[PDB]
Amino acid sequence: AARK
């Protein structure tokens, strides 16, 4: 889900 959360990626950067």
Added chain:
Amino acid sequence: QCTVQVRLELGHRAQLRKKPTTEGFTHDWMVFVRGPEQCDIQHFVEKVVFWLHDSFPKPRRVCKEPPYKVEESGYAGFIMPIEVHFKNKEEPRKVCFTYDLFLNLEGNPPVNHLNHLRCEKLTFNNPTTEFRYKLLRAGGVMVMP
């Protein structure tokens, strides 16, 4: 004509926090570089540089002594370049890896704790006797090409 092979383990652990931080960090995690099976890579490794995302303060994290690891908290995964520098006068003096830090997986029952490991084999061609001694003290094995 001697060829020396050494193995390094790259991995990570991630765990959902019971309570998120004030800035909304959801997970505690660790990324590490180590030797397999009680091999001490400090014989041949000078330092390991972990390159974190720009969002972390001082992203270039250096471990000159074991353990070679970074422990942080955050909200998202990212690609982490990792440089392992050798105790060698000659080239190669360093090897570059990339490590994908992932904090979660999609699953029918949610999993709060996650762990992953990779095995990286390194090949050095005709090293000097001093560096060869270093690699072999760390569990290296020599083959003939």
